[PDB]
Symmetry: C3
Subunit: 450 residues, 3 copies
């Protein structure tokens, strides 16, 4: 519901329109990640290594287990669950909801813990524990692929002091990478907004294996990964055996009805005698008839739609909304002073270019396309020129579908502005200066007059 | 010293209060990192590999050694002054230097002493053939030497010296070296313009050792508790002391500092909660973290710090000034607290502050589980304060929590509050609003100008 | 053409002046990256692994191949012109394209020609069984083929084909493939929406080869000059030319540009130094880097560039406009230079500019050692200019540098300067101030509206 014609005349060519999809209705699945390799195969070339490593790991795992109990000790079941408000004291909206979620996981948590001994037994990278009825809980073990493929197969090929040294390194390195995610950085383990790729650091970042193991598969398996929607949550932490139980949340991508995200392609336009760029949102969210900004930064942009892990719409100035609809004089523009800046764009077979700053010649008519000084852009199409040559490219145009006098129409330009961070402080200060002075002329004249 | 009651009424619920700790009084310790694996065990399946690699490495190491000499050649002991001891920097020589850069150079000179002491074992360093090696240095004062890609040469290339071939044992060694350089370049490449300074994270430096900063530290002895909190808060820095372009190893001085909590200072956190006012949801635009020292309220770039449950740990003071109005708003002048329109499905609807609930029961459905009733919110209210007295155990959607007793005005929900002005924070709009405002301002200056000229 | 003297008096000490270099005139070279290891050496301990992996990879590769055809199917030669000779894009067909995207397509077409030339050795590519392998393009011309996870299959899976088992030799191969995909997605995942453009860093593309961009480049041949500076400045880009969904390899065209320092232009850096004015410390809020071309002073987003000691290297012009007032301030109108209150312990207190010192001796102990006289700063003073004239060798705190002779007004310290207005830059405060200002503005437009109606 934007006025694309006027907008294009100030360098905002109409681009691709995408759908707006958001994650929802997750479906949990639980798996275990043992963060201590099984070295029973080389119990001789161990040394203090395994002992110290256990102390180190218990160090970084303890705060996490603790933070989880602070919630397990305040959730009792009686006729759903009920959180102990006074006990919890201070909690954020989401943090509590994550705790409620933790309690239900608990049920299936203890059920898993039953195979505690069976978990330690694991001696392979990926292991399935179905020693029970239908309870087949998966167990990924860290640095296991190493212990098996490389340390064991050369148990004698090297030595026992070396088979020990190399195992210490692989453990120290794993901790070095593991720390980034589970260090003191993981202040709130209660919440469940942690990306699955982040959690997979406990398994060497092989989040591919971690998800396929669990058996997920969807035509959006990747769009969900990149849009950071496949989150995970720590359910339990065993400080004895050194393994954790994470609950992977796998959602669906559903598209918000009556809503699209229109993209505008910026194109340098000429006005006074300098190049200019309109300072207007490059992406616009429209729902029904409501135009709003969107922090598309935190989303995944594909060719057909914008996928976000949550609604990211934000308010928009009133003037900015008017500008986008027809009030072009309310559209800011900043001076262009760089060699590199978009000079033209192709919107639906038609060209929109600032010839005053690019070589526009008509390959068909052999002639060259000229731009008046009074013209901001040019609209090179089928009619004017069947096969134009903007700069080094040669493209064949189509027929423009708007006002047939676009190039002799004209448009009211907006006010110029500067967006440099330093200058925004300068301008705010500069403006207040003038404002204080004019409030003194209005104050001295008001007191002298009446 | 903030007015938490009024603040909560506009969606800024009182959260956790943390201490303000900063790093200080570092204690140095030096170690050597050899960036060339010892391949004497397979000197036959080498080939040009080791030769080219040396050329490549000498390439990226040279600028660093250079930048260090630019300071070693301008620091002489200030011998002769019986009333001042130390080093003296050649100002005219150095030319242009920043405050800190010089201080880092002065620091470099002091390491030169123990630097040369270490260099004495130059031959002993090249000898290293293990990942981590202890080169007994003086009486009890030892020096350690970490060697890059060594664990590979030993565990994987040697143990299959014949299992594969000699052309392959060569190819695989070239790759491991090229990859190491690929990761090493992000830190010691053209990027490392100023090697004089000592503000480089230890994890960054450890890239020379495959990023195994854990081993690099354990091997040095981290006799501390705040060890992890010091790591994450980027306080354990390192500094290049010496660069040997022959043997290809560098001497880094690790600074292990210690935390210390600033006296009489805390960092109060506010939990944002969407509040209803006109007929739209709103969010107050006020700092989410506030630094208070004595009675001074100031902003803090808590971004660059580590936030734990009990305190905010920073690698340096990060306090910054605060508008005057913003300080007033935080204390009671709520009409001076901006607010921006909410237009997103997801945004905090309620928060729990000291057993009590604060919710927008206009944009969320709040019911009282015990009585069954619906805890509804008036139109001229911003939030609600659901506590013992109102609802003993409420239901905010998929949650059921048991409340406690609010300790403030018992008429919080019938009190009311003066709302602030609305604003838009989108970057693009801040330019629009600055431009828009100046428009109006130029026009009103002309009405004041044309009416001032016409009147007197 | 800046007024460095006045600028220094408000804490903007003159720093190093660097050249302004930009990339240009690239020279292409093509190589192939096979993203499927050759496992013919262990065809028995395979299992479904290789099959599934092929399905997975075909998944993430398909969209890329597709996006490339959307351009190959709309570019035909321009047969029929005496003057002009080249390619012609099907505008109506392409529909919506960005300036650069088309130019990248035109570039793709001219690659394709040599692309097919390479594809001729399709079978020869699959044959590859080594990390890096060299092929025969046209006798004199050659093309290279890097194979993913090959070094693993050879050095570690084969050499222990029996040392372990066949179920394990299979498990370990599955992991190495899954992990490779895990890292490969960051760059070739849905992230890679537009494969037509050629602005993708070479290090990014090298993810297909385990991020060993060193080998990918070394094995490709690179010019000695400004090479690392070209890597770090993100100028060595790459572009996907072809995608083979059968054999699973891609042909990338690496662009090697040459830096070209744009004439009549330098980037002056200013060193910030806390200055004293009222009774508080202050910092001038002015660009720390300034781009000057001829006589035009403009801002520059030096963030996206590589800063070396000698020059600023950027992958494209990054100049941006500058307020008018800000330009004046930088030249002499110091009352037009904003300043923000300093409230942090750590903040630069002095800087060395051309052998001369510039310090806030009110907050840092300054004394001249070559005379024993304690160097003192008055209340009315913003900074101090400690040089040869007054002190041959001074001592700030515990630092000791020997100064040189200042070359400007010999009464710099008794000169004085008009201070600018104070401001607050906290993002939260900028919203508060914009709101605050508009408040006042609406009120003054009502006094001008009520007075104007009452008066005439
Ligand atoms: C305050 O600082 C100023 C400079 O910031 C001090 O003056 C300088 O002091 C230094 C060392 O005390 C002098 O060293 C000299 O360096 C020049 C090189 O300069 C070039 O440019 C000059 C421009 O005026 C030319 O005149 C020169 O011809 C030259 O091309 C040498 O040429 C000089 O001889 C001199 O000494 C060097 O040469 C001797 C020769 O035997 C060698 O032993 C060393 O190589 C010496 O380094 C410098 O000349 C001088 N510059 C001036 C005065 O402009 C000043 O002393 C400081 N105040 C005090 C008194 O402390
Ligand atoms: C000016 O520019 C425009 C756009 O760049 C050009 O005309 C428009 O585009 C085409 C011109 O060919 C036209 O579409 C009509 O032709 C289509 C193609 O038919 C052929 O399809 C196969 C070819 O590969 C093959 O089966 C066979 O050869 C077949 O004839 C058909 O889909 C259909 O006939 C199209 O016309 C109908 O559709 C339009 C659009 O919905 C509608 O108006 C009518 O229903 C119409 O009958 C477009 O319609 C053209 N647009 C218009 C209105 O002009 C044109 O080439 C340029 N002018 C010149 C001569 O330079
Ligand atoms: C808020 O509004 C303010 C006013 O609208 C903005 O400040 C104004 O900035 C403009 C520049 O865009 C200034 O205009 C010109 O200033 C000098 C001096 O010329 C002027 O002298 C008198 C002013 O007292 C008057 O006779 C005229 O205003 C006259 O223009 C000139 O050097 C420039 O113009 C020259 O150069 C340009 C090329 O760039 C040519 O096109 C022109 O023909 C001319 O040769 C400036 O444009 C203006 O002085 C200043 N304030 C005034 C008096 O209007 C302020 O920037 C804005 N804030 C923002 C950015 O949001
Ligand atoms: C730091 O001080 C060093 C002094 O110990 C200095 O090293 C020497 O630098 C000069 C460069 O001028 C080199 O000299 C070269 O050129 C002369 C020509 O007169 C030849 O006679 C020499 O053979 C040589 O090729 C010296 O080789 C070099 N000596 C050392 C110590 O290696 C550094 O350059 C100083 N660093 C800086 C940046 O000033
Ligand atoms: C509303 O809930 C309140 C709890 O948040 C409750 O008051 C508090 O009740 C606890 C016990 O549930 C008291 O704790 C202990 O200490 C006191 C003082 O020594 C003892 O008398 C208690 O028996 C108990 O062991 C808290 O001290 C108490 N808070 C205070 C100081 O009042 C309210 O009573 C509930 N409101 C009503 C009346 O329903
Ligand atoms: C500076 O303050 C001005 C008023 O104090 C403001 O202008 C007025 O802005 C309000 C909305 O903020 C507009 O009123 C609209 O209010 C709601 C919007 O949700 C609806 O009921 C209607 O759409 C209603 O129009 C006024 O129209 C507008 N007044 C006018 C014509 O100027 C400025 O926009 C403020 N500018 C800054 C710098 O913030
Ligand atoms: C969890 O709640 C229990 C309530 O029963 C608290 O009691 C602890 O119980 C454990 C049982 O192993 C003991 O080891 C502790 O000594 C008990 N603590 C106290 C203060 O008596 C316990 O505080 C809570 N656990 C947490 C979060 O630490
Ligand atoms: C606009 O200018 C006024 C001055 O006329 C600023 O208000 C002063 O701010 C300082 C520091 O915060 C106080 O010490 C003065 O007492 C204030 N004067 C008063 C009461 O008006 C105001 O902060 C400026 N605002 C902007 C946009 O920077
Ligand atoms: C590009 O042009 C071709 C040529 O007509 C289109 O045709 C398909 O090409 C694939 C190979 O890429 C064949 O296997 C199919 O059988 C062809 N089917 C058709 C005629 O649609 C191809 O689809 C075009 N690519 C696109 C869609 O841009």
């Amino acid at each position: 519901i934007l006025h694309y014609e006027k907008l294009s005349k100030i360098g905002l060519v109409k681009g691709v329109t995408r759908k707006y999809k958001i994650k929802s209705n997750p479906l949990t699945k639980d798996i275990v990640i043992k963060m201590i390799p099984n070295v029973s195969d080389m119990s001789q070339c161990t040394g203090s290594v395994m002992e110290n490593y256990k102390t180190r790991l218990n160090g970084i795992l303890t705060p996490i287990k603790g933070a989880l109990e602070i919630y397990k000790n305040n959730t009792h079941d009686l006729v759903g669950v009920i959180m102990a408000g006074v006990a919890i004291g201070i909690a954020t909206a989401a943090q509590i909801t994550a705790g409620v979620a933790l309690y239900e996981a608990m049920k299936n948590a203890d059920n898993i813990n039953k195979l505690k001994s069976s978990i330690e037994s694991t001696n392979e990278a990926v292991v399935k524990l179905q020693e029970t009825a239908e309870k087949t809980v998966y167990v990924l073990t860290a640095l296991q692929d190493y212990i098996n493929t490389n340390l064991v197969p050369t148990i004698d090929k090297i030595s026992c002091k070396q088979t020990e040294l190399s195992l210490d390194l692989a453990l120290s390195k794993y901790l070095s990478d593991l720390l980034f995610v589970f260090g003191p950085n993981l202040q709130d383990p209660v919440s469940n907004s942690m990306t699955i790729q982040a959690i997979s650091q406990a398994f060497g970042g092989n989040y591919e294996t971690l998800l396929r193991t669990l058996g997920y598969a969807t035509e959006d398996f990747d769009d969900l990964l990149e849009s950071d929607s496949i989150t995970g949550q720590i359910i339990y932490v065993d400080l004895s055996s050194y393994y954790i139980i994470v609950r992977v949340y796998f959602p669906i991508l559903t598209e918000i009805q009556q809503a699209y995200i229109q993209e505008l392609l910026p194109v340098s336009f000429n006005n006074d005698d300098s190049e200019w760029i309109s300072i207007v949102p490059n992406f616009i969210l429209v729902r029904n008839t409501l135009i709003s900004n969107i922090e598309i930064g935190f989303c995944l942009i594909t060719k057909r739609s914008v996928i976000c892990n949550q609604d990211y719409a934000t308010p928009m100035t009133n003037n900015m909304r008017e500008c986008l609809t027809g009030s072009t004089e309310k559209c800011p523009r900043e001076l262009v002073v760089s060699s590199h800046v978009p000079r033209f764009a192709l919107s639906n077979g038609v060209l929109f270019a600032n010839c005053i700053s690019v070589t526009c010649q008509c390959q068909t008519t052999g002639r060259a396309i000229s731009q008046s000084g009074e013209q901001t852009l040019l609209m090179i199409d089928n009619t004017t020129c069947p096969t134009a040559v903007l700069g080094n490219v040669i493209i064949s145009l189509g027929k423009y579908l708007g006002s047939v006098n676009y190039n002799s129409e004209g448009i009211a330009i907006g006010p110029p502005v500067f967006t440099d961070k330093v200058d925004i402080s300068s301008q705010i200060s500069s403006m207040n200066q003038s404002l204080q002075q004019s409030k003194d002329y209005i104050k001295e004249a008001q007191r002298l007059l009446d």
